[PDB]
Every structure is written in C-alpha cells, then in structure tokens.
From Swiss-Prot:
Binds 1 Ca(2+) ion per subunit. Pfam families: Trypsin (PF00089). Substrate binds at D171, A172, Q174, G175, S177. This is Serine protease 1. Ca(2+) binds at E52, N54, V57, E62. It comes from Bos taurus (Bovine).
Length: 223
C-alpha cells in the first residue's frame, strides 16, 4: 500500500496473509473454512495465516492453516487477468474471535464515489522497494469506468473496476494482490493489478466480486 496508514493490530480481522515460505499475497476470510484471493496468486503448498499484524513477529493471535484445496475461477485469463479470483479451502476450520472474523459477500455492486478500505502488506513505495511488517490501510473511492480506461495500455473488462486516485500518490501495490477492498461492510473487490503503483492517470484495478457471488456460493456448497 502506497500512501496509506498503519491499520492497527487486528482492526481488519478478515485480512489473511498467504505464505509459501514468505508472504506473497493477501486474501479475505469469508467463513470459517474458506478464503477468497486472486487467481494470479495461485501457488502450490499455500499456508493461510490469520490474526496477523506484524508478519515477522509472533504476537499471540495467529492461526496458521494449510490449504486443502484451491479453486481458480474456470475462466481465469492470465494474459488479461480477467476473472482474477480464486477460492481456498482450509484443512481445518479457523477459530473465530474478536481478532479473526469473516467478511460478508455483496448482495449488489457498489457505485462510483463509494468509499472503500483496501489493506495489505505490499510495497509502500511508488519508486523503489520498501515492504512493511505491519498491515497497512488505505481509504479509496470507486471510480467511473471512463477514468479507469482513459490511459490504460491493457484491457479493462466488466469484471474489473478501478478505485483510487487519478493524481497518484495513493494506491495498492506489489504484495497487496489478492487482498480485500471492503465498502459498506461488504467485500466488493480483490486487489488485482495496475500499471506501476500510485502513478498519475493510472488508478488500481480490482476484481469485481459482485459478479462472482453465484459461483462462490455454489462452489463452497459443493466442495
Ligand atoms: Ca505475527
């Protein structure tokens, strides 16, 4: 997260860190046994880490659970990142408490202007590299599709939406992928991609979760 602030320990209880020997992506807990993340974050042997704040210090509220099954969206396109969403089932149910909680799925899509909360342990520099140990937060508005596509060099589909700032300075970044975009208490987006980080004229692009509720529900009920 570039231009954000320190969230505060466990203030984003649904945030998870995906670990494969090191933190490589974020995710969101949607129930005691399932996590939603980005399809481009797929890796074999993923361990899900819940209740985390500082990912390099054991603070006492962590729960480390390995994935038993991973399901990348059937139509995921690695060339365009269209349908960049993936479900991960935990080998054992997470213990829900004040520091580990699930986030609700949307019943409808969010509109432009709506304020959302984006979070993650990704790079904090628009130029260079600096990874934080504690969770970072950023408040950003959903933008119109026009502002989204204006200076884009890549395809932006109906399964994506932009959020952030056109003048740059604030944006998600590498390492934040798979993480949550929460608006009005609902998981509306998944950190997906962007051209660089916090660059002028190029806001971040997010997977539009409201388009996948049916698939998510049907898949979890059958697996
Ligand atoms: Ca920790």
């Amino acid at each position: 997260i570039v231009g954000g602030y320190t969230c505060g320990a466990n203030t984003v209880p649904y945030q998870v860190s995906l670990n494969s020997g090191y933190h490589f992506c974020g995710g969101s807990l949607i129930n005691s046994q399932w996590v939603v993340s980005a399809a481009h974050c797929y890796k074999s042997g993923i361990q899900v880490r819940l209740g985390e704040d500082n990912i390099n210090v054991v603070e006492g509220n962590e729960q480390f659970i390995s994935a038993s099954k991973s399901i990348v969206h059937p139509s995921y396109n690695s060339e365009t990142y269209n349908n960049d969403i993936m479900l991960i089932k935990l080998k054992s149910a997470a213990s829900l408490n004040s520091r580990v909680a699930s986030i609700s799925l949307p019943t409808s899509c969010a509109s432009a202007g709506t304020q959302c909360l984006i979070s993650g342990w990704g790079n904090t520099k628009s130029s260079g590299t600096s990874y934080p140990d504690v969770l970072k937060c950023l408040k950003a508005p959903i933008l119109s599709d026009s502002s989204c596509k204006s200076a884009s060099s890549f395809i932006i589909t109906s399964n994506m939406f932009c959020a952030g700032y056109l003048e740059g300075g604030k944006d998600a970044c590498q390492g934040d992928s798979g993480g949550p975009v929460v608006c009005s208490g609902k998981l509306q987006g998944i950190v997906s991609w962007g051209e660089g980080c916090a660059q002028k004229n190029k806001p971040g692009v997010y997977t539009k979760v409201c388009n996948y509720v049916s698939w998510i529900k049907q898949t979890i009920a059958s697996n």
